[PDB]
């Protein structure tokens, strides 16, 4: 379809950058006041916000990247965590969207917990801390590349892979342990296997150097997350992916075994 002239160059570049743009894996243990559970509540809320404003999934993924990098070097009290998230979503929207919501919308969606002044000051601080390095690789960026290797393309597989990649955003333990390209790999394989019974294609071993064996640790975690998704405290991604835009893929029954 699209001529693939720069596809390999870009893949290579993204593989370099995902290592550099990675947050610090154990950062939460050094936060005195916030926890992984609080982070999950924040990300789940950002899912809702993205739905309300009809934002791209990419924008959500970027915001999560910004948040984890910010919290990797800045101690934050629980009463300011939503401020960090809101400024992150604002910045992601400005980067990624054709029409980002205005700042007043970001204030509104917090029930006026913070002022416009506060959101704009936090924006400045997030930019400072991230040294304006906002063009981060995401799980979504790898997924869209992987989808070009379907035989043939399947809307349900794409939507289900997107769902699983998104679920990974919620749970810092375990998902901070894995790179975006690895989670995307596990998500794609699990989606393919669930919908069509197909597996990670040989063409993607060629492209990425990853095999089912190399993806296995992440795939085992993601399979458990998928199995347990209806019981998770956070449900916004499941609800989102029940809708027709996503072919109701969160209503599909997960495979009980992967036969690895």
């Amino acid at each position: 379809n699209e001529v693939p002239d720069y596809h390999e160059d870009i893949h290579t570049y993204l593989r370099e950058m995902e290592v550099k743009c990675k947050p610090k894996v154990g950062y939460m243990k050094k936060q005195p006041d916030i926890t992984n559970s609080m982070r999950a509540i924040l990300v789940d809320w950002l899912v809702e916000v993205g739905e309300e404003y009809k934002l791209q999934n990419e924008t959500l993924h970027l915001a999560v990247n910004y948040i984890d990098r910010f919290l990797s070097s800045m101690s934050v009290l629980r009463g300011k965590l939503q401020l960090v998230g809101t400024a992150a979503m604002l910045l992601a929207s400005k980067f990624e969207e054709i029409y980002p919501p205005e700042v007043a919308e970001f204030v509104y969606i917090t029930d006026d917990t913070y002022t416009k002044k506060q959101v704009l000051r936090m924006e400045h601080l997030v930019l400072k801390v991230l040294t304006f390095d906002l063009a981060a690789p995401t799980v979504n960026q790898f997924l869209t590349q992987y989808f070009l290797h379907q035989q043939p393309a399947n809307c349900k597989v794409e939507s289900l892979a997107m769902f699983l990649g998104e679920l990974s955003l919620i749970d810092a333990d375990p998902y901070l342990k894995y790179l975006p390209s690895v989670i995307a790999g596990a998500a794609f394989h699990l989606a393919l296997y669930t919908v069509t019974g197909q597996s990670w294609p040989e063409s993607l071993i060629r492209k990425t150097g990853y095999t089912l064996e190399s993806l296995k640790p992440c795939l085992m975690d993601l399979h458990q997350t998928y199995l347990k998704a209806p019981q998770h405290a956070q449900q916004s991604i499941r609800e989102k992916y029940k809708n027709s835009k996503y072919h109701g893929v969160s209503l599909l029954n997960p495979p009980e075994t992967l036969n690895l």
């Binding site: 509540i41 809320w45 809702e48 739905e51 009463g79 969606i109 917090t110 029930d111 006026d112 917990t113």
Partner: peptide, 12 residues
């Protein structure tokens, strides 16, 4: 708006 404003609550 469908989604109303919400102040997130972070209990222990």
């Amino acid at each position: 708006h469908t989604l109303k404003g919400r102040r997130l609550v972070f209990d222990n």
